Design a protein around this nucleic acid. Structure first.
Lengths: 131, 38, 141, 348
RNA sequence: AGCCAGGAUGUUGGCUUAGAAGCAGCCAUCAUUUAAAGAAAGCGUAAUAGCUCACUGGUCGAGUCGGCCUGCGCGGAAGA
């Protein structure tokens, strides 16, 4: 694995994407298939393009290192595998419910849809999004 | 089993043991890579 | 969406009905009959064009038939009627075989996007242009 | 002819296509080579035969259809398509009649020998040297006289000649055999047609890969005591060497001199001489067993070519050609005799 | 270092149209999705399919992996 510069550049890029970010969700592909990647990141390319990072680097000193600068309450997401997925266009877009809808679609475990913190909420199935 | 004088790690699963002073190269994957004194 | 059971992607150009010399027993290795690849193989071939190698799914079930969704033919067999020359690589950089420009491959590239996986048209475009460059063709940018 | 040969090839192609899809054959590589030859031949055959059948139908129907003009114009268009299809069939026959094999590219040795009637053979064999020299200087071949035994009233009795280049044997395969002579000769006062014959052998290069290694790892060297007389030393020491080959079974025994190294030198030189003798004897037997099959007894019998001079005819027994020239044949230009024999010999 | 995963759609790619198709030999050794992927290091197939490693994630959580200079040793080192 590379040295301090590459990991620090990746974490700073993640912080800069959070600073222009929106509502996010959780996913845990412990048994993940590339066909499922070709549904979610195909959806990401369908929305606008390449920008959305699905970066799965939830070690307790890597993604939690960027937590005291943005969204400190996500320090409890430090335990077992969570992959973040931010949103640059649109306040509270429809990508939050799609993980729960594709949870029955060959994606057996999906981090129990505990979600992320626009109202600083908990595990919730929320269809109340601006459409 | 191979009884050569020069021994090297053939595959990735080769292991250097010093059984009874005799240097042996054991392999858990392939039985053919196990060999005598080195 | 089940995992890998029996499907492969191999057949020659679809204008040849029931190709017994080229493929032969490779399509008849399982319980699927040879007659299944002459009668139901031309239900989609006659819709667009005959004579282009188009892969199709061969997922064999135990109910004597097989489901299939037809894919996109590759650019290797596509650069014979839309490139002029019928030859290709073997001497890629030692001599220049032929040249296409960006405005043709970029126009053909989004028509093949029904099977390709890309976030943008330009990414799949430059992918197809690099695949065309791999035969020694020099793109005119 | 070629139409009877092409139909059997198309039937073998249709049989191999059905046998390929049966999936009951374990070996498939020779079947795939047969399918490659079938894809080379039967596609052009099914093009040319169907085009010729449609052309013959559109000709024979519109030639006598109540003397119409529109049917005549349709038959004229079908005749233009027939000329195009005949050019395509000639191109397909020229492609199928191509010598792909590299054994056809080799040089050759021509052996023109006299048969019945010595004086006639001498006149004839000298003229056949003239005939293939004329043929050879047209395509730019090198002609060298290796051996030529003269006759009595001119000509030569036996001619062995190397012709080198690129593709002599593959173009001159079908010339080994006999040649009739019907002539009014210069040695005959009476003026009655006579029959004379000459035999021509065509041999390939067969380049000499001689002197294999002595292989001392394969030599069994038995250094044992010698029989005979001379000294106490002979009894004490061996001074006799027997060396045997494993792959050929040649045994050489040397008991000549005192030291074994002089004996080692003789017991290797005699091995080399006996290897050279046993290999050149097999090579000369392989030459002779093929020459006795190519060259016949030398009689007036039919051997594939008959030449008629007072009638003006050249009639060969294979591919019955009826060329009435004998003036564009006597000065080179042997393409029309050699080419269709190749065309319907590579059909098999 | 071990452990639950991934390790892609055209690549049946043009080649000597019999097939060499990630892995006989030719050369090109692209480019996308990207936590990551060499158009491939090995096994296995007529070629596929398939199995691992490259590498990247997570549990884990303290030091570990590979070259060089030498001293003394090991084996090769079996006779009547």
């Amino acid at each position: 694995m590379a040295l301090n510069l590459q990991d620090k550049q990746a974490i700073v890029a993640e912080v800069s994407e959070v600073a222009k970010g929106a509502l996010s969700a959780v996913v845990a592909d412990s048994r993940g298939v590339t066909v499922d990647k070709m549904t979610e990141l195909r959806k990401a390319g369908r929305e606008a393009g390449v920008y959305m990072r699905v970066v799965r680097n939830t070690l307790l000193r890597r993604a939690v290192e960027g937590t005291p600068f943005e969204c400190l309450k996500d320090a409890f997401v430090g335990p077992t595998l969570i992959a973040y997925s931010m949103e640059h266009p649109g306040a509270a877009a429809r990508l939050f419910k799609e993980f729960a809808k594709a949870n029955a679609k060959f994606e057996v475990k999906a981090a129990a849809f505990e979600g992320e913190l626009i109202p600083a909420s908990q595990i919730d199935r929320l269809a109340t999004l601006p459409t | 089993m191979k009884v050569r004088a020069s021994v090297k790690k053939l595959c990735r699963n080769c292991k250097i043991v010093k059984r009874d002073g005799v240097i042996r190269v054991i392999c858990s994957a392939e039985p053919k890579h196990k060999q005598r004194q080195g | 969406a089940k995992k890998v059971q029996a499907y492969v992607k191999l057949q020659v150009a679809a204008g040849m009905a029931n190709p017994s010399p080229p493929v032969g027993p490779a399509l008849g290795q399982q319980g699927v009959n040879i007659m299944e690849f002459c009668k139901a193989f031309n239900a989609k071939t006659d819709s667009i064009e005959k004579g282009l190698p188009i892969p199709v799914v061969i997922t064999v079930y135990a109910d004597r038939s097989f489901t299939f969704v037809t894919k996109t033919p590759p650019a290797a067999v596509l650069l014979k009627k839309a490139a002029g020359i019928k030859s290709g690589s073997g001497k890629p950089n030692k001599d220049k075989v032929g040249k296409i420009s960006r405005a043709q491959l970029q126009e053909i590239a989004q028509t093949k996007a029904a099977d390709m996986t890309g976030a943008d048209i330009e990414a799949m475009t430059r992918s197809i242009e690099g695949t065309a460059r791999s035969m020694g063709l020099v793109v005119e940018d | 002819s070629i139409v009877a040969k092409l139909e059997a090839l198309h039937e073998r192609h249709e049989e191999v296509q059905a046998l390929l899809g049966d999936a009951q054959t374990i070996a498939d590589q020779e079947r795939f080579r047969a399918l490659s030859r079938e894809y080379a031949q039967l596609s052009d055959v099914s093009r040319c035969f169907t085009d010729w059948q449609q052309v013959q139908e559109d000709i024979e129907t519109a030639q006598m259809m109540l003397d119409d003009p529109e049917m005549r114009e349709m038959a004229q268009d079908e005749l233009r398509e027939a000329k195009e299809k005949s050019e395509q069939l000639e191109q397909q026959l020229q492609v199928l009649l191509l010598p792909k094999d590299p054994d056809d590219e080799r040089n050759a040795f021509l052996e023109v020998r006299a048969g019945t009637g010595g004086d006639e053979a001498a006149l004839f064999a000298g003229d056949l040297f003239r005939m293939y020299s004329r043929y050879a200087e047209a395509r730019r071949w090198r002609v060298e006289i290796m051996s030529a035994s003269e006759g009595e009233h001119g000509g030569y009795k036996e001619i062995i000649a190397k012709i080198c280049g690129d593709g002599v044997y593959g173009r001159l395969k079908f010339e080994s055999g006999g040649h009739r002579v019907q002539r009014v000769p210069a040695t005959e006062s009476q003026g009655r047609i006579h029959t004379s014959a000459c035999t021509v052998a065509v041999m390939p290069e067969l380049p000499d890969a001689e002197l294999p290694d002595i292989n001392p790892a394969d030599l069994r060297i038995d250094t044992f005591r010698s029989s005979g007389a001379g000294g106490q030393h002979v009894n004490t020491t061996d001074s006799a060497i027997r060396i045997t080959h494993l792959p050929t079974g040649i045994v050489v025994e040397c008991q000549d001199e005192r030291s074994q190294h002089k004996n080692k030198a003789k017991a290797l030189s005699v091995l080399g001489a006996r290897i050279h003798a046993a290999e050149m004897a097999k090579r000369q037997q392989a030459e002779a067993s093929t020459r006795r099959n190519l060259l016949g007894s030398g009689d007036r019998s039919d051997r594939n070519r008959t030449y008629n001079f007072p009638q003006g005819r050249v009639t060969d027994h294979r591919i019955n050609l009826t060329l009435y020239r004998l003036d564009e044949v006597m000065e080179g230009k042997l393409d029309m005799l050699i080419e269709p024999i190749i065309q319907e010999h590579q059909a098999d």
